[PDB]
Design a protein around this ligand. Structure first.
Ligand SMILES: Nc1ncnc2c1ncn2[C@@H]1O[C@H](CSCC[C@H](N)C(=O)O)[C@@H](O)[C@H]1O
Ligand SMILES: [Ca+2]
Ligand SMILES: [Ca+2]
Ligand SMILES: [Cl-]
Ligand SMILES: [Cl-]
Ligand SMILES: [Cl-]
Ligand SMILES: [Cl-]
Ligand SMILES: [Cl-]
Ligand SMILES: [Cl-]
Ligand SMILES: [Cl-]
Ligand SMILES: [Cl-]
Length: 194
């Protein structure tokens, strides 16, 4: 399918290190040891980073190629991570309620379609523990109107999407590392709690 196609090679988000915004959450004390889920984990850089910093990590992604490459990376780097092929819009059949202390989202929200957004928020909300944290990284949208392609998320769009089920702690300007020529893209980091 679609996501197997993009992993026939190295897509622009598929950097060889964890995203700096998530590394900084470790440095700032915001990500503390617990059970963590990386939704749309790709080839596993952020998930492995969380695992090397005291978390029990599960990563879920639609693309078997990404999951297979993520697993091999964890094996190479002597780290234990639970990498599984799966659909975040169906993960109620994979995880029970109130399971994860942390959910990280590095570019998944960015690709979730409008008609799947409410369902997406509900599934993320369901698998998080009481008091659980959701950290989401996306490209920032500060331009009036919605002509920009690919989509980018404004603070209003983020607030409108995640306020119904989450308490928003902050939406911070950050950088998103990319393989494309402006290798640093303006981005938002949402910190939210269940
Ligand atoms: N419904 C869904 N369920 C699980 N994964 C999904 C999904 N829709 C898209 N994805 C995955 O979400 C990822 C977005 S690209 C981001 C990959 C990784 N988080 C990184 O930072 O490198 C892709 O790997 C894609 O296969
Ligand atoms: Ca806009
Ligand atoms: Ca937008
Ligand atoms: Cl990093
Ligand atoms: Cl599916
Ligand atoms: Cl279903
Ligand atoms: Cl479970
Ligand atoms: Cl629907
Ligand atoms: Cl418009
Ligand atoms: Cl880079
Ligand atoms: Cl709640």
């Amino acid at each position: 399918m679609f996501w197997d196609e993009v992993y026939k090679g190295t897509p622009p988000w598929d950097i060889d290190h964890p995203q700096p915004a998530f590394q900084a959450l470790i440095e700032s004390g915001e990500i503390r040891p617990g059970r963590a889920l990386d939704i749309g984990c790709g080839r596993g850089e952020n998930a492995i980073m969380l695992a090397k910093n005291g978390c029990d990590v599960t990563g879920i992604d639609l693309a078997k190629r990404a999951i297979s490459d993520a697993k091999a990376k964890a094996i190479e780097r002597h780290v234990k991570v639970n990498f599984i092929v799966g659909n975040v819009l169906e993960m109620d059949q994979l995880f029970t309620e109130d399971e994860f202390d942390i959910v990280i989202d590095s570019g998944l929200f960015h690709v979730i379609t409008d008609e799947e957004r409410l369902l997406f928020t509900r599934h993320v909300h369901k698998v998080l523990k009481e008091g659980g944290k959701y950290f989401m990284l996306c490209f920032s949208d500060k331009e009036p109107g919605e002509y920009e392609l690919p989509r980018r998320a404004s603070k209003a769009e983020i607030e409108s999407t995640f306020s119904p089920l989450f308490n928003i702690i902050y939406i911070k300007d950050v950088i998103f590392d990319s393989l494309l020529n402006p290798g640093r893209r303006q981005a938002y980091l949402l910190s939210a709690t269940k």
